[PDB]
From a paper:
In 2011, desmoglein-2 (DSG2), a component of desmosomes carrying four extracellular domains (EC1 to EC4) has been reported to be the main receptor of HAdV of serotype 3, 7, 11, and 14. The critical entry step in the viral cycle is mediated by the adenovirus trimeric fiber and more especially by its distal globular domain called the ‘knob’. In the present study, we investigate the binding mechanism of the ARD causing agent HAdV7 to the EC23 module of DSG2 using biochemical and biophysical methods. We report the atomic structure of the complex solved by cryo-EM using phase-plate providing improved high-contrast images.
HAd7K in complex with EC23 resulted in two coefficients at 6.9S and 9.7S, suggesting different stoichiometries. This hypothesis was confirmed by the cryo-EM analysis in which two populations corresponding to HAd7K with two or three modules were found. Extensive 3D classifications and refinements indeed show that the complex mainly exists in two forms, i.e., a HAd7K trimer can interact with two or three EC23 modules hereafter named HAd7K-(EC23)2 and HAd7K-(EC23)3, respectively. HAd7K-(EC23)2 and HAd7K-(EC23)3 were solved to 3.5 and 3.1 Å resolution, respectively, which allowed the fitting and refinement of two atomic models using the existing X-ray structures of HAd7K and EC23. The two models are very similar with the exception of the extra EC23 module in the HAd7K-(EC23)3 complex. The overall root mean square deviation (RMSD) between HAd7K-(EC23)2 and HAd7K-(EC23)3 (without the third EC23 module) is 0.5 Å. Each EC23 module interacts with two different monomers of the HAd7K. Furthermore, each EC domain (i.e., EC2 or EC3) interacts with one HAd7K monomer. For the EC3 domain, the main interacting residue is R316 which fits into a pocket formed by two loops at the surface of one HAd7K monomer. R316 forms putative hydrogen bonds and a salt bridge with D265 while the other HAd7K residues defining the pocket are F269 and V300.
Residue numbers in the entry:
A (entry chain C), B (entry chain B), C (entry chain A): 128 to 325
D (entry chain F), E (entry chain D), F (entry chain E): 100 to 330
Write the structure that this text describes.
Amino acid sequence: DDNINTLWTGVNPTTANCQIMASSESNDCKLILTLVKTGALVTAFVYVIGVSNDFNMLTTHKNINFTAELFFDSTGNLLTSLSSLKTPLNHKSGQNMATGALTNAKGFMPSTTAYPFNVNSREKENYIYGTCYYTASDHTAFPIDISVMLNQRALNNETSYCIRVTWSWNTGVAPEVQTSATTLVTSPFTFYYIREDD
Amino acid sequence: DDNINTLWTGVNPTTANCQIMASSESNDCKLILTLVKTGALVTAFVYVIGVSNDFNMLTTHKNINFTAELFFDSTGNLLTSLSSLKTPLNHKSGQNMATGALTNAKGFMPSTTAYPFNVNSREKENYIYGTCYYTASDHTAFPIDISVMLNQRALNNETSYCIRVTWSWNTGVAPEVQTSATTLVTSPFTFYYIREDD
Amino acid sequence: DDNINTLWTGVNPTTANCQIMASSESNDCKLILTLVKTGALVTAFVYVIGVSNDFNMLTTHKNINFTAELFFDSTGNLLTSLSSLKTPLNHKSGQNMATGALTNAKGFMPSTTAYPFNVNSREKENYIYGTCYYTASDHTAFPIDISVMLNQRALNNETSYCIRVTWSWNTGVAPEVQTSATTLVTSPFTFYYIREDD
Amino acid sequence: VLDINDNEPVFTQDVFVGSVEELSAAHTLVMKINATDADEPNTLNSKISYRIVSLEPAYPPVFYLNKDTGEIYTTSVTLDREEHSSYTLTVEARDGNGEVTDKPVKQAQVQIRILDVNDNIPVVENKVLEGMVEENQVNVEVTRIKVFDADEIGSDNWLANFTFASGNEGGYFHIETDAQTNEGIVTLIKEVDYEEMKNLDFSVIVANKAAFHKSIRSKYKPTPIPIKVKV
Amino acid sequence: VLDINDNEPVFTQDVFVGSVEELSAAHTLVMKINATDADEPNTLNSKISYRIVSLEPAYPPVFYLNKDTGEIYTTSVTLDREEHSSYTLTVEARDGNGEVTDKPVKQAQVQIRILDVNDNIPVVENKVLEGMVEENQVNVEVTRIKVFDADEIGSDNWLANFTFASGNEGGYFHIETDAQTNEGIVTLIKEVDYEEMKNLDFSVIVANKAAFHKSIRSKYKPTPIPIKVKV
Amino acid sequence: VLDINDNEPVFTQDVFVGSVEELSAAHTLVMKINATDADEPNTLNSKISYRIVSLEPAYPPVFYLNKDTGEIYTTSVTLDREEHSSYTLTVEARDGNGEVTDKPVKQAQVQIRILDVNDNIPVVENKVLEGMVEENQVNVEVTRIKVFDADEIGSDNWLANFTFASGNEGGYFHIETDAQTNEGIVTLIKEVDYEEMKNLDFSVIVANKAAFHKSIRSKYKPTPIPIKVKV
């Protein structure tokens, strides 16, 4: 059964499932996550789609940073009350999330052997860097720096794993103007990490 | 059986299987494609190898763009009469394409839920960007911008899926001169997409 | 059994397993390799961690190049007496290398059909390029050019496959100073190749 | 009367004018050679075989002619207008089954203009600028920003647009732009007591009037030009 | 005595001073509005609902106010000090259950300074430099490197630091830096017989006294400034 | 006669000259210290243990000496010739089983030149250029492009090569290059009636005579230098 090798938000949820900005009173964006167990690694496939107007108005500025922060317990279940994503991940049922309980979700987690908590001599191994793109209204691709940070902090004793994705741009012009701004969509970003034992 | 999880052109076909340039009277290049079903994603692995002299003379110019455009029917079978690649894809038999019919080829296709046809509010999600390289004769790597575009248009009612790969460079010198130009080979490019249901 | 689809050095070995620099009298760094059989491709996941002081002092210079060179015999077994990595690869047992013999290790190797030995007309297909990062002490990411070279040379009749990874930077400042230099760790690098038959 | 080789293929006029945009993608339809046959239709001479005879700047193989339909397209070699503004293209239509003989036919000229995109960022032809400002001086056009843009002199891809980045918030100055010279004439609308021994250092940003092309947007990182004016 | 709407919410002072670093991440805690209620605790008027009334440079939506706690944070719009050095922020505390009426309350002003990071690489305001050097000339401060840095004039992110890249190994010259003008005053400590008709060409590297920010480190690729001095 | 410690290890000459290319990869074979033993072969004193005593520009740890064979290689620290043109290397051969005593031995000097690669793009030392051209003026060498290249003054990695990018298609001008000064002397081979009040604006591209190195090719994006000449 290959549907149990994926842990992911669904393809295009009907409502926003993530609250990036703290000023937002409710969920303001759709976070698309995918985690695929490829051998001893996890292939992670992430992007965001803006829903709220104040999230979509970020394309009118030239210095933007925002952050999806995800916390997971000892079984790998998402801590939605502390995470940006407010809907728990699940397995594959076609284009949608499955419904039941999670089996071996802990194996999807970043490995604490490779990515330890609170080790100053080994902090450099917690970092992943990359680039995604924002297509403008005139089909201009603007590069976006992505910093993925694995197992950085535990907010409480419940948190056992941590994934912090940070998108940012520092551009010479705003990618859009106030009239032409429609929706902040980032091109997908694929990174890898060594996964925890099942 | 892990040979049915790959849909691909073969490794180094004996003759050219793709016609990139419209001025070419027959196939002018070898297109190497690979599609691997990794969970709920497809890992796609593409490059081109020049065969014809007028395709290989592109390395003598500093502004180049070319495009492999692939159309697929409702079952995922390639429409060779409309696509750049003139040989249908097949499964794995060692280093070669298999021979029989295709099983669950539709699952290799880009998902119309994630990548819809003709939606102006969601067009930005159809775009993938990246970089490959061209090694010169003096072992200089020239960067090549790649734009992958998923489910953009249907030429007719037969087309149900679409993959447009576009390579381009805009360099300050020509990578080769007329004598030193041997063969236009691009470094492989790996991208991902959310795949259609099987 | 999905533990046999990975060939890899272990996660954080207790001692250094690789000798990058020739001036080193013993192993001076930990090489982390991972090879995952994804369909007809291998996903390769590599980075280095500095152990010795003379390997870690490279961060105090602005022009660095170093090379992990790996040679494999006809069965895919690593030739440790010729390779930078002095410990043979093995399968997955949790976060550690397994112990027994290798099964179908030859399938993890770069394909000689796609990547032939000593063909001047097809040398350009042996090249892979990419970028990893070095996080500085002030959390500055410095880009590192990576050149992966597949099946370039055989030192003897025993060598049947070859993977040369070369990291280098040419920066405008040294990433560290002599006091602030702690450990040379590169961000992980993922590349793909067409794999040999099993 | 048979469909013999008895005439020359017929054009509609001797001069065809097409137009194509700079940096257009491959197989972009430039134009069409609308020809006709004076003989009977569905005949061998009706099967018109067009043929590009000559480019006058022949070195880049830019255009392609569909020999069956006469549609002229762009190729994988990308157009750059700032090296070749326009092209002239001698073509001929040929009757018969594609036999190549030295028999004369009717051949036409084609003029193809290349339409400019804003693919060049304006740069300043002067580096240090400084002016002297006194009191009861107002509406004073003392200094002018030299700029240089390559995009088709006279067009809106070439006309400089200026904004203040920092220094002028009180409203001391204001930029007009001269189009015959492409000059950032910056003015003086608020007077300064010259006796104050003060500074009015500022820095500007140079860009074209029209928005940049999608190729060079996201690559445009303006560095503010530091004009120091002493009063 | 009930917890009626009988007063205005109480501030500790009319002027609050906070401070935040340039290019800070989102949800960075800038400051806190320490207010109090003169009424009974655990009451409706004790539930203070803070509200940002006005930014004076209102156009960028930079700050966020936690209306329950009064903690002022940064947002996803990243701060750039070199366009707005500081911010002024009129806020008001409101009692009750969040009812919005035109009843007056006590409202305070907030001043937020933006702390500078070294996010700008210094560039030279002069391009060609050359001096004449004679014999029995020593401790001679003949030429000065113009530089320009945008990072908060007077700070160590703005003060130029100079090193020789090539040319001066004998120890002919030595750079001092003027701070009132940010000037690379390069000296002459070893004499040259001017009759020798020699050359003392060299090239320098310009950088700030403080280390560059982590955003622009790894993007700093210095090109050596080629100062040619003829003796 | 035994193989006692009775002599000093024998060199072939006191001065060894090697040579290595700039930006060479690690473990690139620079040279070899060809020594010999005056004692019996296959002996302890025959086991020569070479040892690098001193680098004179000792700060970068560039070279490695195989103490068994005497082969000198490059290390992971990459050579840059434009900071250190050559190296001097005092080494000594030692007999015995690697015992380190203060007993004198025969020690030699090694001179290693670094061979230059074209790793620097030439840049113009002048920014604005303009000349006055009259009629019956021909073969006129009125103006000269200042350039600056760092790659080993006198070499072909340093000699400027010029091409016209735009402006001169009639054949008005022609660039010669001065090698003693590295100067783009541009000429005048077609006369202009000065009374015409015309313009002959053009733009050139500067590059070295030799092709650029593979490190900086694909990073070379030339911006055309806009020389405006008024007639």
